[PDB]
Amino acid sequence: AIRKKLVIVGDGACGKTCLLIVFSKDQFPEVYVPTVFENYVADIEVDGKQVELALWDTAGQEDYDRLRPLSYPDTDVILMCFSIDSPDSLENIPEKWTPEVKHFCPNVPIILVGNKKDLRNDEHTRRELAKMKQEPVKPEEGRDMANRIGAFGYMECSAKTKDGVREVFEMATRAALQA
C-alpha cells in the first residue's frame, strides 16, 4: 500500500467536516455529529491498487492566511468543496480558493465537489434562497465552474444520505495516483 495525502478546502459552511466524518466512520452518526475532525488514514483499494489515504480538513483555518497554508505541504489531491444550498459558496471558488490551491499545490489535481446535493429538492431551502433572489446550484453550474478553474473533474454527494460519498474518495485516490 502506497501513502497519499488528501486535503479538503472550501468555505466555513460548505459541509467539508461532515463529508470527512461520514466517509471515515462509513456512517452518518446517529447519536452525535462531531464538531471537528482530527485526521484519518483510510485503507482504499481503487482499480486494483491498495492506497492508505491520509485525510485532512481546513475548517477553522478560513480566516488565518498564515496558518492555513501549513495544511498544504506534500498534498496529493485536493477536494474543493461548495454547498449546493449556497450559490454564494460557489462564487468564492475561482476568486479565493483556486488561486490559493494553485500557488501552494502546483500541479496537484483538484476535484470540485458539490456537497448537500439533497437540498436541491428541499422546499425549506428553496423558500429561503428565493428571499435573496436565488436557487440551489444547478448541476451544469457546478460542471461549468469545475471546467473553468481547471479541475480534474466535478462530482456531487450528500453526507446526510451517504450518496456519492464513497465514489468521491475512490476517484480522489485515482487522481492522487496519476503521473
Ligand X SMILES: Cc1[nH]ncc1C1CCNCC1
Binding-site positions for GTP: 10-17, 28-35, 57-61, 115-118, 158-160
CB of 133 to other proteins, least distance (A): 29
103 binds ligand X (CB under 6 A): yes
Residue selected from 99, 128, 130, 148 as contacting ligand X according to rule CB under 6 A: 99
64: contact with other proteins by CB under 8 A: yes
Contact, 87 vs 137, CB < 8 A?
yes
Burial of 24 (0-12, 13-18, 19+ CB in 10 A): middle
Q: Taking CB under 8 A as the rule, does residue 150 contact other proteins?
A: no
Cell 491498487 belongs to residue = 49
Sites for other proteins among residues 20-49 (CB under 8 A)? 29, 31-32, 34-36, 38-41
Asked if residue 73 binds other proteins (CB under 8 A), the reply is yes
Residue 65: CB minimum distance to ligand X, A: 4
* Grid cell locating 4: 497519499
* Residue 95 sits in the site that holds ligand X (CB under 6 A): no
Q: Where do runs of H (alpha helix) occur along the chain?
A: 16-25, 87-92, 98-104, 123-130, 139-149, 165-177
Those residues whose C-beta lies under 8 Å from the C-beta of residue 102, and which sit 6 or more positions away, are 150
